[PDB]
Structures are given as structure tokens and as C-alpha cells.
Amino acid sequence: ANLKQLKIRMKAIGSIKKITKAMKMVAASKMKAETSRLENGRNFAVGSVQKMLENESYVQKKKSTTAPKSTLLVPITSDKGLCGSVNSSIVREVKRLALNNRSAFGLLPVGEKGSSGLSRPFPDLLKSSIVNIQNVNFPTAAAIAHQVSTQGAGYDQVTLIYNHFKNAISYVVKHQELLPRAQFLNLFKYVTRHEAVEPELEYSKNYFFELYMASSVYNALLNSSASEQASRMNAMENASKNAGEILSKLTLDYNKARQAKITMELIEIISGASI
Amino acid sequence: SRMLDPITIGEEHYTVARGVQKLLQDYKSLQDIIAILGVDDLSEEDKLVVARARKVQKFLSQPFFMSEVFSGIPGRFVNLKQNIASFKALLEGAGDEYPESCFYMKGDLEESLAAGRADALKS
Amino acid sequence: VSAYIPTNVISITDGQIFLETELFYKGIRPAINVGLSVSRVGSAAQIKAMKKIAGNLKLTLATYRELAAFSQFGSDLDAKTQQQLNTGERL
């Protein structure tokens, strides 16, 4: 069946499996660094402001306990494609929570795929996004926390959607809930159990707000970046597996076509030699 | 079929025919990459084509009265008006929310919705 | 087209019009594969008003066929590529 065409398509699958197999190696190599960086940066000042605020008894007595009617969603996704199904899951969950009720979320995306995938379903809702992150570091995560702080004044709550890197092969979506600056300052000014005199409360309230926001942001990026390489490696493994199976199947058909070709040509030669 | 032309049959029937052919044709041009890797990394507009193509493919199947012993389910007789209307609503995106299983071995589009709606009620 | 009879006829005739079954079902009727179709006479037969417009038409369609793959890639699109991609779709 036109052996020349089959052998060409087999070559294409071979290259795909080759490059697919190579990207898996790089996916594991980069995952190693992310895991090393995550284990070193994880749980960095996480829950600190939350713990002390809980330790503040007088604050809880006067804590304004209300349900935020309008919140801000900042989903975290990878920018490079072919990273796995983690991006599809994040954009899927935010889509569900957003499609249900509209005009109650700002939906400031993070990552090319997260923003691109949500551009068409939610037009006029997402206005800006962050992409092309050179490296993950606390100074950068703070700049991201600042941008969300500026856009969070209009909303009563802020939450981040990202993958949680619990295992090298298990990444579960996890979402943190962070209150905006306005609600945090009014709640923080009641702090009385923990003295703040070295910097005055008017300054300490704003500074500790950044720590409260950047810590969550910086932690989420690591979990998502680690899940990217983890999900990417698995995707290449499954892709390379499927590439090999299909390539082997065509090899059988190529041999079958080879036998038929010899049979066809051989019968022609015998037909001419008969007469 | 030589009978398939806009002048012989109603123009609507011709449009619905090309809509299904174009849908499955576009989906056929992507089955290659779908085999190597899943559709998750696939583009959104392309995923919709793939998703909707599956629904139509499953809906094409229907039980026959003579084949009732083989499958064990009663056959279905689909009228021409129901045939055109069934696929017309499906191409528009009527039963896209329901799972592709409810369209398996169904006579009319409304029948699949009843099964698909019940599947959403139990869960 | 690698068969015996088609190959011979192609070498005998001047030009050949390739019909694609994929283009036919995708709504492209007449399903003509301009990438392979060719004519020896070329613009020598077209009229003056046609040669001028026919020249640029081929170039525009040539670029569109290339960017067809990038559409699947997506995730970004330059201003010019968006125009060339759309422009080719009109043709």
C-alpha cells in the first residue's frame, strides 16, 4: 500500500517519539531543581500573620466577620505549552466558579495558557495578566502581590488558584483565600497583644500586609512550577508511550505491505514469462 | 450520494449535511495528534470541534429492529423531519453539556436529552 | 498519484488540477489544491486585468497555508500574522 508513504509517516512518529522522549528527560531535570527550590522555600512565613492574628484575642472579639460579596481570582498557570493537563484543570475550575456567576470576579490571570484559555470565555472580565516570568523568587512574587493589592481594593476578597505539588506524580489543585488591604488594615489596627513600637502601627500594618500577601503568592508559584515539570514529565511519558505503540503498529503494516508488493510484482513477472 | 445537492433537496438539509461532514472532517484531521497525546494540550477552539464531533459520532448509532437480538434493545425508526432537526440542534450546541454516553443508541435528539438529563439528576 | 497510469498522464499533459477529498468535506468546493496545481502557459493566457491581480493572489494564499499550523499552536498572535491569517481566510 505505497510503502514509500508508510515509511515516511513512520519516520515522523520516530522523530516525535525522540523529541518527546528528550523533553521528558528535561522535564525530570527541571523538576529536580524546582523540588530543591520548593523544599528550601516552602512554608516560608506562611500562616505567620494568620497565627499571630489568631493569637490576638482582642482582635477576634472585634473582628468584622462578614461574607465577601465580591472577590478577586488570580489563577496561576504555566506559560510554556505541552506541560500537561495541569493548565486545563486550573482554567476549568475557575471557568466553573466564574461561569456560574458573572460580574463578581476580576479574574486577573497568570500565565500565557491561563490567560489565553480564559480570554475567549470571559471577555471584558480579565483586563491584565502576568506572563514570561524569567525566574521564581520572593522579590518578583512581591511585585505580583503589589499588582494584586492595587486591583484588590475594589473587591472584598482575593484568592489564588494553583496546583499543589504534593508528590512527584500527584499534583492537586489548591486555592488560598486572602483578604484585601482595606479589610486587613482595619482588622490589623486592633492588634494589641503583640506590641509594635519599633515601627509605629501605621507603618507596621502596611509592611506586614505585604508579607501576608507575598508569602502566599511566593508559595503558590513554587507549587505550580513544580507541578508543571511533574505534569510535563508525565505527559511526555504518556505521549512517548503512545508514539511507540503507533510506530510499532505501522511497522507491522509496512511488513505486510512489503510482502504484498513482492507478491504483486512477482505475479507480473510470472505472467509475462508464462506466454 | 449523487442525491446530495442544494437544488434537489431542501437547502436546510444541505447545510446540516455539510455541517456534520465539516465537523467530522476537521476532527478527522486531528485524530493523529490526539492519538500521540491527549486533547488537553489542544487548543480551545479545536477541543470544541473534537468534543462536539464525539457527540455526533455517538448519536449516529441507533438500534435496529432486526438487530434487537444482537444488542438486546428495541429498534428505532427516525423520521426525516426528526433526523434533520435532531442533528441541527446538536450542531448548535444543545446537548453538549450532557455526556456523550446519553447519545449512544438513541433514535432522536430529544430521547438522548431525556437520558442525559436523568444522568445529571441522579448525580 | 504514484500509480502507473496517473503518473504517465501527468507527464503527458501540461497542467493538472488536484482534487482533495479533505478540502471537499471541509466546505472548500471546488476542492482545488493550488499548492500542487500548475500550468505551463501560466499568465500567458490570462488577460491584463487578471495577471496583475492573479500574481499577488498566489503569494497571499501561499503565506496563509503556512500559518495554518500556528493556529493550533496559538497562545499568541502577532498583529501582522493576524492580518495575513484573516486575509487568507477571505480569499
Binding site: 509517516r9 515522523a12 | 495528534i33 | 503556512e66 495554518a68 500556528f70 502577532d78 501582522k80
Partner: peptide
């Protein structure tokens, strides 16, 4: 079933887009 054409188009497509911007900088 033609994956070689898919890779070929992807090659020319991305290269054209990539070098199209490089042409702007070069000019």
C-alpha cells in the same frame, strides 16, 4: 493520517512567525 505534513507545517509556521519579528528588528 498524515503526521509528516503536520510537523512540516508547524516548522514553516513557527519559523516564519519567529523570523517575521526578527525581520522587523533587522529593518
Amino acid at each position: 493520517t498524515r503526521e509528516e505534513e503536520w510537523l512540516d507545517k508547524r516548522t514553516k509556521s513557527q519559523e516564519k512567525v519567529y523570523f517575521d519579528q526578527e525581520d522587523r528588528k533587522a529593518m
